[PDB]
Design a protein around this motif. Structure first.
Motif, short mmCIF file in Angstrom:
data_model
loop_
_atom_site.label_atom_id
_atom_site.label_comp_id
_atom_site.label_asym_id
_atom_site.label_seq_id
_atom_site.Cartn_x
_atom_site.Cartn_y
_atom_site.Cartn_z
N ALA A 1 21.48 -6.20 79.09
CA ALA A 1 22.28 -5.19 78.39
C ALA A 1 21.35 -4.27 77.61
CB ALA A 1 23.28 -5.86 77.48
N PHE A 2 21.85 -3.08 77.30
CA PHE A 2 21.10 -2.11 76.53
C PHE A 2 22.09 -1.34 75.67
CE2 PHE A 2 17.58 0.67 75.68
CZ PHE A 2 18.19 1.85 75.30
N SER A 3 21.73 -1.08 74.43
CA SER A 3 22.56 -0.20 73.62
C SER A 3 21.70 0.65 72.71
CB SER A 3 23.58 -0.95 72.77
OG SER A 3 24.48 -0.05 72.11
N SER A 4 22.15 1.89 72.53
CA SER A 4 21.60 2.82 71.55
C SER A 4 22.75 3.22 70.65
CB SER A 4 21.02 4.04 72.22
OG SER A 4 20.54 4.93 71.23
N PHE A 5 22.55 3.09 69.35
CA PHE A 5 23.67 3.24 68.45
C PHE A 5 23.13 3.62 67.08
CE2 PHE A 5 22.70 -0.90 66.70
CZ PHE A 5 21.99 -1.47 67.76
N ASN A 6 24.02 4.15 66.26
CA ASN A 6 23.67 4.50 64.91
C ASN A 6 23.91 3.32 63.96
OD1 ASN A 6 22.85 7.12 65.47
ND2 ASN A 6 24.90 8.00 65.17
#
Lengths: 6, 6, 6, 6, 6, 6, 6, 6, 6, 6, 6, 6
Positions: free
Chosen positions: L1-6
């Protein structure tokens, strides 16, 4: 101004 | 990302 | 001016 | 990328 | 002026 | 590439 | 793979 | 931007 | 943004 | 996988 | 935001 | 899995 973005 | 700016 | 771009 | 500029 | 280019 | 210029 | 990018 | 990829 | 994934 | 992002 | 996941 | 988030 403001923004939220990837 | 987030930015607030003039 | 503002821009978000690849 | 992102840029804020005059 | 502004440019984004490959 | 990108540039900001007069 | 290959890429370019800002 | 540009990319070549599988 | 750009992503390549399976 | 690969990604380009802010 | 973005995500890739199972 | 991969996530980019604030």
């Amino acid at each position: 101004a403001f923004s939220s973005f990837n």
